[PDB]
Write a protein that binds this ligand. Structure first.
Ligand SMILES: C/C1=C2N=C(/C=C3\N/C(=C(/C)C4=N[C@@](C)([C@@H]5N=C1[C@](C)(CCC(=O)O)[C@H]5CC(=O)O)[C@@](C)(CC(N)=O)[C@@H]4CCC(=O)O)[C@@](C)(CC(N)=O)[C@@H]3CCC(=O)O)C(C)(C)[C@@H]/2CCC(=O)O
Length: 384
């Protein structure tokens, strides 16, 4: 039932997640955060009863109100600063197409709650949201806007692909490998996802506002609720979170922090930097000999999984630069320079092996991977 989202359980999860995330930000940077960017998918919030909406609401310092008997959400309440041991944090929400289609009432609740917070009389130190909204509202009025329209424009925090469309709109570009820099991905990303959603707003084109929001962002955030997929067995994670982060860098010239958080255990959510999660997946899956044993008893599908992994590794390197040499080395050593695994791929899927050795040579060229010795570089183009 959509009417009951976010749930009490999802709000506990998202309230705890938000605090661990601010703690972690303060530990990495030595100051309070003022602006996060969040990604929000449909099936994820169905499975958790609205973890991401919850989190975004706790970050801005607002809480759902439920009917005590039916447990439908009937509205929101502002957490007052009396109840806040940390500052409100500004949130910009990149929503997927399916999330747009499945959770419009929750988009409407988020949109309202954030405009409400944006209209309080709090100090800048405590409320960056209000300070941004009023200042940008001022600026649009200076240049000659109707105050009503300034309010609307300065107050959008929800952004996605246009009505009837889906995805991150990078797939054309990235697969063909026709980009000069991050700027090309960021351009395409902004184009596709630059549509605003509000209480009574149905997907206006506002690419300018999205740029203004992404310039403020200090950290990109994504929550994963299950251990069934991982950020390296699908293209979706790098497109959404890697895309956003690439865009902030194109706009600001500095790569924001990225945090890829674990909500698979709702009682204990773990915050991790993207670098840390990539590492966990390489140790626990990609380069895990038990996992590699497994996919060598699946022939074609199995060697596809291998090639795919290096693809998404490659794609994270290009969007965020948060893949190290160690990682590329690990997949080369475990996939190509293990003749057991090489031979398995040559036999059972010669395409996947050429794809693989192509993406590894592109990694050397583009500077993602400086190999252990030049022996490596010869063999890889050789094999292609
Ligand atoms: C994370 C996302 C996901 N979509 C996937 C793959 C699939 N979706 C598919 C498709 C093809 C689609 N995947 C969608 C649902 C996209 N998949 C997503 C997105 C990014 C988000 C989905 C969400 O909001 O949960 C979808 C795009 C969007 O909604 O804007 C989709 C709308 C993409 C598009 N048309 O451009 C489109 C559905 C179209 C339709 O039918 O009418 C497949 C059926 C085929 C494929 N390999 O592309 C596949 C099924 C799972 C598997 O093979 O293991 C997952 C599961 C890896 C992944 C995670 C979701 C989760 O966390 O549970």
């Amino acid at each position: 039932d959509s009417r009951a989202v976010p749930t009490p359980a999802a709000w506990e999860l998202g309230k705890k997640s938000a605090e661990l995330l601010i703690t972690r930000y303060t530990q990495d940077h030595g100051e309070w955060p003022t602006s996060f960017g969040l990604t929000a998918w449909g099936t994820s919030n169905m499975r958790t009863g609205g973890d991401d909406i919850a989190q975004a609401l706790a970050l801005i310092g607002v809480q759902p109100v439920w009917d005590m008997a039916s447990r439908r959400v009937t509205g929101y309440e502002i957490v007052p600063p009396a109840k806040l041991a940390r500052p409100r944090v500004d949130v910009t929400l990149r929503i997927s197409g399916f999330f747009r289609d499945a959770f419009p009432e929750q988009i409407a609740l988020f949109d309202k709650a954030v405009r409400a917070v944006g209209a309080l009389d709090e100090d800048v130190e405590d409320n960056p949201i209000a300070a941004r909204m009023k200042a940008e509202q001022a600026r649009l009025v200076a240049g000659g806007a109707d105050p009503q329209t300034a309010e609307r424009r300065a107050g959008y925090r929800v952004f996605g692909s246009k009505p009837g469309a889906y995805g991150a709109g990078l797939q054309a570009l990235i697969d063909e490998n026709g980009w000069a820099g991050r700027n090309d991905l960021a351009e395409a990303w902004l184009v596709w996802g630059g549509y605003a959603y509000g209480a009574g707003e149905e997907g206006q084109a506002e690419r300018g506002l999205l740029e203004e929001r992404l310039r403020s962002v200090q950290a990109v955030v994504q929550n994963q609720d299950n251990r069934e997929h991982d950020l390296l067995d699908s293209d979706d994670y790098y497109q959404f979170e890697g895309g956003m982060a690439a865009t902030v860098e194109s706009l600001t010239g500095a790569m924001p922090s990225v945090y890829h958080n674990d909500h698979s255990r709702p009682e204990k959510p773990v915050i991790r930097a993207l670098e840390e999660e990539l590492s966990r997946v390489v140790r626990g899956r990609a380069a895990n000999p038990k996992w590699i044993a497994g996919v060598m008893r699946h022939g074609y599908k199995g060697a596809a999984e291998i090639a795919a992994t290096v693809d998404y590794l490659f794609a994270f390197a290009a969007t965020t630069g948060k893949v190290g040499n160690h990682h590329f080395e690990a997949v080369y050593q475990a996939y190509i320079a293990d003749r057991a695994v090489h031979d398995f791929m040559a036999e059972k899927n010669p395409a996947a092996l050429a794809e693989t050795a192509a993406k590894l040579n592109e990694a050397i060229e583009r500077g993602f991977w400086t190999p252990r010795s030049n022996s490596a570089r010869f063999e890889l183009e050789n094999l292609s």
